[PDB]
Design a binder for this molecule. Structure first.
Ligand SMILES: O=C(O)[C@H]1CCCN1C(=O)Nc1cc(Cl)cc(Cl)c1-c1ccccc1
Length: 134
């Protein structure tokens, strides 16, 4: 398995736990409603150790870029400014966020042709499944 295998435009087809994850973060109701109802596309591109992940929907449209293994300032959709590191480890892209003494992890994996995105903060989890747009 390689990081290049995650490249492409992906469309959200299933979600579990995402509102609960947003509540654990303390995201306010206006943003939670947007997250519960949005069906974003995720667009992942890489070039060696360079990675970009873009999100698109009528309700919001964010993007970050990084070098694998390098700490960087990530502005999240909910407006945190985190210290983030992304690594491709044991067949998963792992995105580790730290801010204000807190931490959250997002993983992204290829399974049976689908992109599986899993989030966690303080044992509150989500699982989101995407299918390739081609
Ligand atoms: O990319 C994904 O499938 C999931 C995994 C975790 C972030 N994510 C989103 O879809 N993000 C989000 C998507 C929408 Cl429509 C709205 C918000 Cl507020 C977020 C968001 C971002 C950070 C933390 C909480 C909510």
């Amino acid at each position: 398995a390689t990081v290049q295998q995650l490249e492409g435009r992906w469309r959200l087809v299933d979600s579990k736990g995402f509102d609960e994850y947003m509540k654990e973060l303390g995201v306010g109701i206006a943003l939670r409603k947007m997250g519960a109802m949005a069906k974003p596309d995720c667009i992942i591109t890489c070039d060696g150790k360079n990675l970009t992940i873009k999100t698109e929907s009528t309700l919001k449209t964010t993007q970050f870029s990084c070098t694998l293994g390098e700490k960087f300032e990530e502005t999240t959709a909910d407006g945190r400014k985190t210290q983030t590191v992304c690594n491709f480890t044991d067949g998963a892209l792992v995105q580790h966020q730290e801010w204000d003494g807190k931490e959250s992890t997002i993983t992204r994996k290829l399974k049976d042709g689908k992109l599986v995105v899993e989030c966690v903060m303080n044992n509150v989890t989500c699982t989101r499944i995407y299918e390739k747009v081609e």
